[PDB]
């Protein structure tokens, strides 16, 4: 559908606006691993939007300070925090350091609130 036609000389511009994926093709795909309904059941949260926050600054924090931000944000009331999209594994913070410290912050905030808590580990 998008392979080559967008570079065709005879067309100066081309945009794919919508698609009808038929029922028979859709059934071959999994769809969402969990989905909205099971997600809310796993979190035991129903009735309001969910709440989150990206840790800032985008880059530069250590794993230990990452877990601190996650702990503070969850304890203060957020359902989730998250790694920034460009936080993967870097000289200032390798990823296992972030993951273990965030799990301490998550479980601390869960024990401090009685809620399921999490953070999107990138």
């Amino acid at each position: 559908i998008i392979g080559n036609v967008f570079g065709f000389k005879a067309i100066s511009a081309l945009r794919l606006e919508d698609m009808r994926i038929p029922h028979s093709y859709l059934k071959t795909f999994q769809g969402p691993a969990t989905g909205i309904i099971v997600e809310r059941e796993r979190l035991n949260k129903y009735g309001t939007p969910l709440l989150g926050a990206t840790v800032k600054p985008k880059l530069g924090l250590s794993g230990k300070n990452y877990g601190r931000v996650v702990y503070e944000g969850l304890k203060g009331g957020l359902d989730f925090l998250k790694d920034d999209e460009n936080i993967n594994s870097q000289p200032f913070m390798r990823w296992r350091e972030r993951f273990l410290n965030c799990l301490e912050g998550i479980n601390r905030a869960a024990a401090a609130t009685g809620e399921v808590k999490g953070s999107y580990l990138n």
């Binding site: 230990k64 877990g67 601190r68 702990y71 503070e72 410290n101 301490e104 912050g105 601390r108």
Partner: peptide
């Protein structure tokens, strides 16, 4: 000893 995050 593993209580990393004392309260600010």
């Amino acid at each position: 000893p593993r209580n990393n995050y004392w309260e600010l």
